[PDB]
UniProtKB/TrEMBL annotation:
Name this polypeptide is given: Single-stranded DNA endonuclease
Residues the record lists as binding CMP 2: T215, Q339, R411
Positions with a binding annotation for Zn(2+) 3: H108
The keyword Metal-binding belongs to this UniProt entry's keyword annotation: yes
One function term, GO molecular function aspect: exonuclease activity
Annotated ranges, domain DHH-CID: 199-277
Residues of the DDH domain: 28-156
Binding residues for Mn(2+): D37, H107, D166
Domain DHHA1: 360-466
Residues annotated as binding CMP 1: K407, S409, R411
């Protein structure tokens, strides 16, 4: 349960600081995350600052590192805005950006350190929010923009795209101030909430690929198998080449019933059945069959641009650049194909490569899975049943920039959190011991360690997670 008014008062404090620099003509340096949550965040800032006539400079980065900060200190700008990142780097921002004004618009459990007067943290977790459900980075940026100018409520759909990219409706419904963003979008008529199949491909994919791509949750015997997905849809009376948006509201409901009956007949869990059908946000600002028409397809489009280090192109897509959109549309297929190959590699190599401790699975894929896909891989390992879901899963891959550097993503489930696991806290502690950087949510976190400390990290993280069990 959040204190929404107290959080908004915090937003106004950050707004008054930015207006100080806007009125002096200071260029706003913007650092945002590479995923859809960060790309939408930067687009919201770009539009909001544009409405105020302010100048800005956006960089789309993978994480807030000490090396990135060492460069940001000798740049030139007077004010820096970190959006969809920075909550886990407060002491490093404090150490390096001590001479400059900093605003952090993020939703991760913040590093428990004090801040300087000109560094304002805008984070809903400090006001009682659940970090993965109640608001995302684009949502914090949205309320920042809305307080700056109420006309920025027309960015409510873009903000929701980021929340869907961050899977804040993973249980099937929206929570927290995401519902307040949705209301703003509804009053402007720029978004609409449906109760539909919560899978990728509503707009641009045939039904059989929508079913075969389903990994969160998986559809038994159908996930990863387009041929069986075709057979199942035909026997239930559906054209497998039809797109979900082409179905009538009647055929949709009958599809849902068949899928729910199918889940039950194959022993799927209650929680997976309940989240298969849920809130789906669409936008009448875009035509049907366009990936921008639906939030998950929009978010997947933006993640595809980030995958090829073209996140600035995804920002332009959010701002309406149709040329950027035509380029971005050609990146989605290879993005979804790499996820399919990742899942096949997981099924083949999990048993022979995973390191299973008393409290964690640690899988090192080398470079068989892209460093920006280890989060999906860890989630896929759980949803496919490879891993005991009450034991957290960490997937490591060599980073694209440094072969001696590893990128790891940790994922777990709700009932593991009930046992006391907190991945963000555990990874943060282990990071300080192996000269790395880590942190994140209790259910989902990331860490970067040098490759040489991998075997030591596995022992260390298993011990740290074991100490949390209570
Ligand atoms: Cl991560
Ligand atoms: Mn985020």
């Amino acid at each position: 349960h959040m204190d929404k008014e107290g959080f908004l008062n915090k937003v106004r404090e950050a707004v008054d600081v930015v207006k100080l620099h806007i009125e002096l003509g200071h260029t706003i340096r913007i650092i945002s995350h590479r995923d859809a949550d960060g790309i939408t965040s930067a687009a919201i800032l770009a539009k909001a600052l544009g409405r105020e006539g302010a100048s800005f400079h956006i960089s789309i980065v993978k994480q807030v590192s000490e090396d990135l900060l060492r460069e940001l200190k000798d740049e030139d700008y007077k004010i820096f805005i970190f959006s969809a990142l920075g909550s886990g780097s407060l002491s490093l921002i404090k150490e390096y950006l001590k001479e400059k004004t900093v605003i952090i618009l993020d939703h991760h459990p913040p590093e428990n350190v004090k801040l300087e007067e000109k560094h304002i943290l805008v984070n809903p977790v400090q006001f009682g929010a659940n970090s993965v459900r109640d608001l995302s980075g684009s949502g914090v940026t949205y309320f920042f923009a809305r307080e700056l100018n109420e006309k920025n409520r027309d960015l409510a759909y873009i903000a929701i795209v980021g929340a869907v990219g961050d899977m804040q409706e993973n249980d099937g419904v929206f929570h927290g101030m995401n519902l307040d963003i949705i209301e703003d979008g509804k009053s402007l008529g720029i978004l609409e909430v449906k109760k539909e199949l919560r899978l990728f491909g509503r707009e641009t994919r045939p039904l059989y690929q929508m079913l075969a791509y389903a990994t969160n949750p998986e559809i038994p015997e159908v996930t990863g198998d387009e041929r069986k997905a075709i057979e199942w849809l035909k026997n239930k009376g559906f054209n497998p080449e039809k797109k979900y948006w082409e179905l009538s509201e009647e055929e949709k409901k009958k599809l849902h019933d068949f899928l729910i009956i199918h889940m039950i007949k194959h022993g799927a869990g209650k929680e997976d059945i309940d989240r298969l059908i849920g809130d789906v946000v669409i936008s009448p600002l875009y035509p049907e069959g366009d990936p921008r028409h639906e939030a998950r397809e929009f978010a997947t489009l933006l993640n595809a641009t980030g995958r090829l280090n073209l996140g600035n192109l995804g920002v332009a897509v959010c701002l309406g650049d149709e040329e950027a959109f035509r380029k971005a549309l050609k990146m989605v297929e290879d993005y979804k194909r790499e996820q399919i190959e990742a899942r096949k590699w997981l099924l083949q190599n999990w048993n022979s490569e995973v390191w299973e401790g008393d409290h964690v699975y640690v899988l090192y894929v080398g470079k068989s899975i892209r460093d920006t896909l280890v989060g999906i891989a860890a989630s896929m390992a759980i949803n496919a049943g490879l891993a005991d879901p009450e034991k957290p899963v960490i997937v490591f891959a060599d980073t694209d920039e440094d072969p001696n550097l590893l990128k790891g993503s940790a994922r777990t489930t709700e009932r593991a959190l009930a046992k006391g696991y907190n991945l963000g806290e555990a990874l943060r502690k282990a990071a300080e011991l192996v000269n790395g950087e880590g942190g994140g949510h209790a259910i989902a976190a990331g860490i970067r360690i040098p490759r040489a400390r991998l075997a030591e990290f596995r022992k260390l993280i298993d011990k740290i997670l074991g100490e949390q069990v209570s």
